[PDB]
């Protein structure tokens, strides 16, 4: 009954029929060469191991901070336990032994904690870095200090882009585990290394380094999907007796009409500039969605179409006279004595936009839940909407601009942000104007959409420093995204959906807090809106990855602070901040940002509006500056990184479960310790606070004990004993709350 | 009734995990794996009963509502005093150890409970004796 | 590269001190009234969070002009072995600052009985040890060395003895906690004399003057009433050493004794007691004493005693405003206020010396290591004359130093390739020498290019260094000295 006609899978690459990776500059054709990720990372790890060896043989071991040596030793143990070769693992452990001796000798307490970590997880360095030691790049510090042989341009570029932390040289399972665990409750990780002049944010570098690791997705649509199954033309087997006695209004280019059954019949005329194809695609898409309402579990009250045909322009012009904005609608319609009309029936609330200020906050929460649920279900199906709100790289606003460009560091100024979501395609009852949808494959191929809007991503990245004078090519880690651009545009689509949700809620707040005076009431409205936005991000994660909603919300609130998002939405989305002078503005920014540098601008404020370029509509951010809403951007990156990191972690978990099962069935006859290491890794690669994965790993550990009886379980009794205790507790609470 | 909602969330999480293709339907090739991951480890014949009688459509895959129906059917057999006894005798050491330990583990392992809930449980109660008083 | 305002641990240390002791009410029944600023309530109005934060900032400032003076090449004090305050390693400063957060965490009330004083400091030491042992994993390996050092700082906090002049960790805590209590001590010149003499012995006249002036700025930024300096006040002087006064010997001089190998000795201390013509010493009488007015530069100088501006009524409005109770109940806000006050006190002396488009303009370039050393030498030699003067105006010396040593003027009379993003200089050339440009008021033709900008410095606009900084190492493995300049509308 319930299932999605699209399925995810792996591919060789997306680099089929893209623009050739050549940049044209005043008669020079510069070829753009990628820097492979998974190979430069491995070369850096090898240089790290060699430099650790040179450290140990240099006896300068006493000239390193004790926590830094602890990090070195823990990383060496974890990396060793990630390797499979006997020679490499033995080499890594023979490297880590002298550091272990040094720790247990000089700093007994540090070692007392380190052994606690080692017996608690198989990759200890990921439990040792859920704090502000992750900003300390021990790897690169050592490589710079002791490996004196200069790095090649590939390693140099990798270091330069990823100098932020040291979790950027981890192998895929260790890094994915660390990224997923950084959101766990007991983690104090905040991707912000605030030193005395910088405040380096790298919440986007985590996502970039995660994407550069994944293998290119492709979504395969079923044969009977809406964009694969094809149906014939639509017959005008029903003509609406269109009568001016029942018109209610003109919504943009749509005539409304009453119904004695309390429903509303709308007629959308052919908008000027586009053909009948758009109206028929809207008709067919609406009919398809209404046909598969039960399967999709879509919530929107969807517009049941009745027909699509043509009527004479005279009739439309003659019925429209009794309106308010007749002239504007007359200018919106096309110039032709006959025009194309699409007729649908929708509930009355289908036309009051989501951000209409005449609905109480509870109804706003319900409608936002409906719209986010429906957006992301239809994204799972493979139907993306690229024009929910005309937020106008070719003019489009990229919600994840850092991933999709070379040397773009913060989000962009949402010019006329309240204008953008004025006629948004999100309505109080659900979604609307389903016509301009786009099958998901249009991100994983070189469609006209992808070629037009994201040309920079597909053509590779250029900058005058990327140019190697010797080889005459631009060697860039960004160009590698050519193979992977489908994942980047997928995440950008999710971030766009949530950005439009945020701007709609913000427009609602701006429109409601004009008519309210008691400041506690205004801040209560804005706090409820911040709650709704965070809950919508949690709903996106729950729908896209299966993580329960509460756990996803907790994993978000660990990352994007809700109170600062409150304060920034309440501050930069109302004209009230335009009244204040310079110093009062300064002190209010000290409160909204609260631990991170303020939004600094030089442009002049127009009274009663705020920041602007025209002088009569409000911007979200000064001209040619970034968006002042940090915690919104942190929320977007937290959401997309949670989704992609959960997917990659689950890929790794299955890649390890296959290796475990090939042992328990004898297909790889090895020692007992090999199987025990396999099960330990399979335990460490489970989602944070995801119990059933740990229960499965415990079952596999019991089976491995049964197959290898005489094996020592001394090093694996602790964590699995804890897992058994937790499972017993789980069933105890189940029985206890049953009654 | 149906079942506790917190089991519905866990079922949905596990089902969406073991769906390698992200389509909302699982093939029986790893239905056993998800079932053992939910405290249900049946032999290939016991589950083969359902591989026979599971798929109403017949396509060879299980949709999520059918999966919930499967779990509701299979939750009326294993849930008994056996699991409760196994949970009781997994801490330490003569059938009556302590209640402070139980109150401690109820607040940090698994979905944590409140101090008031632990106090109510302690006043309700001797592991064997307290287990059979509910 | 380390400071108070961006630490995330000292910040959390002060956060813990506010959450457990500084934000908890007085319980001693001696001046225990929680003041009410606006709608908000402050428990420790005298010795609350603002006091701790000002003390930490004083520690940083004292050590900062200590190393400043060391760069100037004058003579500092000695801690029983060749070394001075300027020789404080940054992690030692971090240790001192974590110690200072709890130095007042045990004050049940303002009462200063010696036994009660000792009890309060014992409670403060116990609270400090309880905190460190609670976050022991993150502090003993890296911040401190061993539990013995934590015990040493606990000893310094509790301070069973009174040998504050023993180790730098002693001075930068006791002097810092002592000089903060100038805002409340009613006879101003006596206390300021005592503190100025007690701290100049460590550093020097100019740096102590700078410390006190920036202390006034800290007071302003934290909404604390600033005491006026009255060099000719007729109030009777009291010696801050203990609590006594100076009675005159009825003719023109106080009670003066005589040591061996000396004809005359300084003033003799007596308790406030019966006079008669045995009058006391007035403050004006105390200041113009030739034996003391040759070392205290403030003799004969006066200060505003308030913001040079808005009147007494508006000033009183500001003092009782909400932000006064916000600095008392928010570590983040008070730290931000102090940081901006420090930046202004760091760049305002430059404007003081020289009478008078985005703000920050990073401009990176690659330079040889020997040239970077020879440039940092001659840029620190220009930073180490910009002490924020309070009594003695030394504008000509720093102006001549800036004018004659125009070796850091190799960025004007030409175009530029600037931007306004740190990473965009790290991410393109990853230069080993960044030139951050601070210019809040015009003075730069910061025309956009298109993102990034491109500046042009006129002849009548100079650049003056502010704080040379070393920021890690480049991609190719060499240090990245990120300088910082300020733009001066210099008609000269
Ligand atoms: Ca499937
Ligand atoms: Mg712009």
Residue numbers in the entry:
A (entry chain C): 100 to 491, 502 to 848
B (entry chain B): 3 to 94, 97 to 129, 138 to 146
C (entry chain A): 231 to 506, 510 to 589, 760 to 853, 861 to 902
Pull verbatim passages from the article behind this deposition.
SidE family of effectors (SdeA, SdeB, SdeC and SidE) employ phosphoribosyl ubiquitination to target multiple host Rab GTPases and innate immune factors. Upon activation by host Calmodulin (CaM), SidJ executes an ATP-dependent glutamylation to modify the catalytic residue Glu860 in the mono-ADP-ribosyl transferase (mART) domain of SdeA. SidJ is a unique glutamylase that adopts a kinase-like fold but contains two nucleotide-binding pockets. Our structures reveal that both phosphodiesterase (PDE) and mART domains of SdeA make extensive contacts with SidJ.
We added l-glutamate to the prepared SidJ/CaM-SdeA pre-glutamylation complex right before applying the sample to the EM grid and analyzing it by single-particle cryo-EM. Interestingly, after 3D classification of the particles, we observed two well-resolved particle classes, Class I (15% of total particles) contained both SidJ/CaM and SdeA well resolved and Class II (17% of total particles) represented only SidJ/CaM with discernible density while SdeA was found to be disordered, presumably dissociated from SidJ but still tethered to it due to GraFix. We pursued the processing of Class I particles to obtain a 3.7 Å reconstruction of SidJ/CaM-SdeA in a post-catalytic (PC) state. Overall, the PC state structure of SidJ/CaM-SdeA superposes well with the pre-glutamylation state structure with an r.m.s.d of 0.71 Å over 1351 C-α atoms with noticeable differences only in the migrated pocket region of SidJ and the mART domain of SdeA. Interestingly, post-glutamylation, the SidJ loop (residues 492–501) making up the migrated pocket becomes disordered in the structure, while the canonical pocket architecture remains intact. This observation argues against the role of migrated pocket as an allosteric center that stabilizes the canonical pocket by binding to AMP. Consistent with the idea that AMP releases upon SdeA glutamylation, the electron density corresponding to AMP in SidJ’s migrated pocket is missing in the post-catalytic state structure of SidJ/CaM-SdeA. There is, however, no electron density in the post-catalytic SidJ/CaM-SdeA structure for the added l-glutamate near SdeA E860, likely because of the flexible nature of the modification. In the post-catalytic structure of SidJ/CaM-SdeA complex where one cycle of glutamylation occurred, SidJ exists in an apoenzyme form, with no nucleotide bound in either canonical or migrated pockets. We have also determined the post-catalytic state structure of SidJ/CaM and SdeA, in which we captured apo-SidJ bound to glutamylated SdeA, likely poised for the next adenylylation and glutamyl chain extension reactions.
